[PDB]
Symmetry: D2
Subunit: 403 residues, 4 copies
């Protein structure tokens, strides 16, 4: 194994230069900081202080702990084998959406209004841990409604579908009912609207205070993002709470109609709910969260199982049909990917079995969705055969980046 891969990377010459190995490694799309590569990069750093050039036996020493993963990377066995070609396509789509500079930045609170209209970043993480970022991908921003699927998933993971769906429905309202809080069975319509998300919030880690509930959720997001940036915006929390009249309206109505688990402190659930909307990510950390969803609940950069299959399948289903506000039907039809948008300008996107993305540009269209994000998501499915109901064999002129 260690030896066979030596012959792939050497191919004549009995010594591999270190940079040659690293630069072939990066070109698969793995980063050198990948947690699954640490034994190998540790042994490499130590070799460079013990002697820029590797024999068979020294290469064996470095890679033998991580050899299964390096083999797949070098045998082009990753989900996207020509990743360099792919990223060049992402970059083109990025540049094309960059010309769409209309929309209006959200301003209802000071913290959304301050963000520049020209911030625009796209991050990819495949289900094999291959990474790409273009534009403003290391700039923190609040998840807002992008957190709705993540706390839904956490709820289904801990409690099961059956319990969760005793409290929250499973369908879009339909466009003329995007301002009823309840369906005919007196449940919120689905987890992706505010009333539904407020009830989901009330299910998570019952019988502990908000500090522990918050810490428990944050632990969960950490694992989903493979330990990348997950932070918190107190400024955003305070504004959300000092101006969430509509969500307070939702909470009293739900209390009235008995929508909560017994023993619920509705006013504290609203506090929890605003906290969760204020959790901060970057394009890069969030792309990994989306890839966990794309990868059956396994984080692709650590290999850790974070969510049950049930949790992930339910979440992708509801993101497909209810994920993009009143554009949910049009998006399902034209893009046909699980996606969730937010008022900060994020679009969490999942291509099941392939990758997770986060697109972010603050300016929103009249439905609440990032203009550039929406433009990018249309272009991505125009280009690649990723639509849910694209055929994997007969896909016309679309490119299939899995071949």
């Amino acid at each position: 194994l260690e030896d066979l891969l030596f012959y792939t990377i050497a191919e004549g010459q009995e010594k591999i230069p270190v940079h040659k190995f690293i630069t072939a490694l990066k070109s698969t799309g793995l980063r050198t900081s990948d947690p699954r590569l640490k034994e190998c990069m540790d042994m490499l750093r130590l070799t460079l202080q013990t002697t820029v050039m590797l024999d068979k036996d020294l290469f064996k020493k470095c890679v033998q702990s991580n050899i299964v993963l390096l083999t797949q990377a070098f045998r082009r066995k990753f989900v996207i084998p020509d990743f360099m070609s792919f990223t060049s396509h992402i970059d083109e789509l990025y540049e094309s959406a960059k010309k769409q500079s209309g929309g209006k930045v959200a301003d209802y609170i000071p913290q959304l209004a301050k963000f520049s209209p020209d911030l625009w970043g796209v991050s990819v993480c495949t289900v094999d841990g291959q990474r790409h970022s273009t534009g403003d991908t290391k700039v923190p921003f609040c998840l807002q409604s992008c957190v709705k699927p993540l706390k839904y998933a956490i709820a289904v993971n801990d409690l099961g579908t059956e319990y969760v769906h005793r409290y929250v429905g499973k369908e879009p309202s339909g466009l003329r009912f995007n301002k009823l809080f309840l369906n005919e069975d007196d449940k919120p319509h689905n987890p992706m609207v505010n009333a539904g998300a407020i009830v989901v919030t009330s299910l998570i880690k019952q019988g502990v205070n908000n500090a522990e509930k918050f810490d428990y959720v944050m632990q969960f997001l950490n694992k989903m993002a493979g330990n990348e940036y997950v932070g918190f915006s107190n400024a955003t929390f305070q504004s959300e709470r000092e101006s969430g009249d509509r969500n307070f309206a939702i909470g009293y109505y739900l209390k009235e109609k008995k929508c909560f688990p017994e023993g619920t402190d509705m006013v504290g659930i609203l506090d929890f709910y605003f906290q969760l909307c204020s959790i901060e990510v970057t394009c890069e950390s969030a792309s990994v969260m989306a890839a966990t969803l794309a990868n059956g609940g396994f984080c692709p950069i650590t290999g850790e199982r974070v969510l049950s299959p049930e949790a992930v399948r339910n979440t992708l289903s509801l993101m497909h049909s209810c994920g993009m506000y009143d554009f949910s039907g049009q998006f399902a039809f034209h893009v046909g990917l699980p996606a969730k948008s937010g008022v900060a300008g994020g679009i969490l996107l999942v291509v099941p079995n392939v990758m997770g993305m986060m697109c972010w540009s603050p300016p929103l269209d009249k439905m609440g969705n990032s203009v550039k994000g929406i433009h990018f998501c249309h272009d991505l499915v125009s280009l690649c055969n990723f639509h849910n109901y694209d055929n994997l064999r007969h896909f016309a002129k679309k490119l299939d980046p899995r071949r």
Copy 2:
């Protein structure tokens, strides 16, 4: 030599015919497959024992397809096992004797499968004709989008469910039927097809289209259903007049004529067998899997499968999308057209319907199928719990 490679695989110095036949059948292909006609013609002509020379002679024309078959390269390589499961599911749904026939023996129950590679299986009453009714709706939507394009068609009809609270309005807020899967939308879609020729030629064209989709298996027509439908279709006449008034038809429409065509299209007959092939065409990117012919554009199939996902099972559409996550379309005669994209097509048929209008046994079967196998649209192909994956 490709024909000699396959000769050695199957053999011994001499292959009996019956032995080649039964090895072929175990791949799931049928000897009447159109793509295997030259081979079967050649065997008929040399008739019970084949040498290498004579075997090459019979199979050389269809050698590529026979190679895949005996190379387990088909989408379900172990088809004999897969059909065993299907039979268990069939028998399990057979015990679900609830529901009410629309007003056929209530005890009629069949299930047919056609993979995207042409592998076939049937259990139960799969050769008994019955009317598509609303199962026809995705098929004529597909035709419309095939001939005219997404942009044209979606000027007349929407892309979304109404929402449970809205199963009773004919139009969305833009004055268009909500989607092609409800009566009002289907009526408008019927008005788009083959404009400016008379109903007899429109019917002929649609029938020719359905024939390709079914790979020339049974498609027919119940005049008795047609007459019954037009006599008792007051709701659809209300829909037609509403649509006319609200100006939902293309310029020059004869509205009452379109209702006649609409009732005709609902009265078209299939069996479970022929309809499974139509479903497989949709599962196979617009190519008929037992003839190799492209019947529909990939646009037409994508659109159709999406709208079947969200809008396909009446008021059970949203529950069905969540629990089953497959494109499907039910009809009042008890049919459920089911597509498992990239894998197979299925028709299930059992006349007794639940309180929502969907075949009881069909519904149980569909739930079980996705409980068993990782076919839900948002199952993961790598990490998938205790489920069976028939592709591996």
Copy 3:
């Protein structure tokens, strides 16, 4: 009889004077309840322009009860001349409201007729021009239905409330009944209740007789041109017919396509402002025609009808009108507004150009102004009415 002689008298009364004293009450000389008196007057003018106590007794003794009421100022509006001056000003004031769009008649056309509950009459503007009732016919055929069948039977088929402004495009309430008789679906179902079992010609004739008595035999006609136009462009009403058939809204054995033909017929019936004012006065008068004394409708029928006109009578402006005008009123697409001031009078206003909601602009302006001036709002007080005039005193 003698008493009345002194009131109008010398010991001799010129004929012209009696006549002009009579007209000033606001009775017309053609009033059917005055025909024996006016016959005798025409005859005595032949039999010899001046009347003694005995000659005057021979004319007016057949109709002395009604003349004594007119002359003792015992009619519902006693100073009718002053009131008609007020109507004339409101007429002129509406006449400057020249907005609105004619339904697709001259936009200039604008008339207002009045008939009190005692038969006193007044007209201004284009009051002798025929026009189709259209939706103004809806309360008249409701009244007929309730008259023949009773409230309980009719209201198994039709509700008794407004949809509410969001429900104004649904055909059925939650009970699977049209909301009320004043919308098309409810009217179509009421049409289906009237004179069941006979053909459309006898049904139409039957309804025409009824209108003739409500209008005291003044003009009730028919526009075939309007009928043809309505049928060859009534898709929404055919949509309604089929939907109602589907939901089993009709009485057993209804021919629904025939009922739509009958329905379009009744929409095409023609009145003038003058004849229609008398129809509205019949409703104002507990179902008695004020110019003949004939009982045309049961009280139950008229109460029911006024109620539903109050709440559902002006299309989507029904709620606003009930609040600000507080009168039973029914509008139609020809520019008609049938108006009732219960216990006082009926009116027909007519001006083709309609506002955004389908109601004659000028009619609507006149009705607002009428209720600003006078204490006729349903819930105006009779003792304590601020700035308003009360024309009953």
Copy 4:
């Protein structure tokens, strides 16, 4: 003179009049000896005291002589009131046999009221009074307060201001669960969302204690100083369990329905206070008669409300007053009325009388079973429907004759 004329009428050719013979003659007209408009006469009888001559009688009745004349020359709006009250007494005994319905139980205060409590009080626009049953037992107005606070608002601010924050129409049965109409305003003042907004309009820019006092003063004049109180127990239970009204408040706040500078949580406190105000059938009936009498309290003569306020209030009670039964009630009864969850029905017969009916058990709609039955019978008997005709009314009774 007037005092002499009235002397002979009651004397009946006698030279003197016993007091008890003047009092019972007076009481048969419908008036009570405690009528505020009869204080000066009643005082002057107290003072002189059992037999009155022409001169003594004239002395006693001078100041009130306009009112006593109208009464003794049968000039009151219901001239034979003894006959009328007997008709009311038979309707009350007939509604008494209707003992179905559920007493409201959702707070401790309403759930303890006996189901058999049943009172009917009448007060004509002339101050004639009849009570049968349990008419002196305090109970909360609840939603019967809504027309009263609306009247006050329209009295103080005018129609045009008030209807900038609240609508003029019922929602339609199937919109009994929406808070706002298409223009983002509560549908009418007779629903909770409407009444919360109306409550925010009243006496703006003072504290809730002064606001409450102002409304309580207004209610006193409306009742001609008869019993008005407050149930602090009710107020406490309402605020504790009013989660739906908090939902409404926050929705209205979000959607910007309140006047500028509103403290929404404070308005909800005031709203709950107003619902917890107590009346009896007797005092309520007088409030209803004020509305029946164009804004003039019939037993004090005082102008309490503008004619605008009263007309607007009666219109909106006609159409929106009886919860989801509003349209059926308008149709069959055709009188302005408002019902409350304590079992009250505030009823106005314009130009004739006010009533309060009170029986705690509610039907499925929320309206008193017995009150509803009574109201139907009342209008079966008498030509009081708003669209009954005054000349041709069939075999109905007209009590104004």
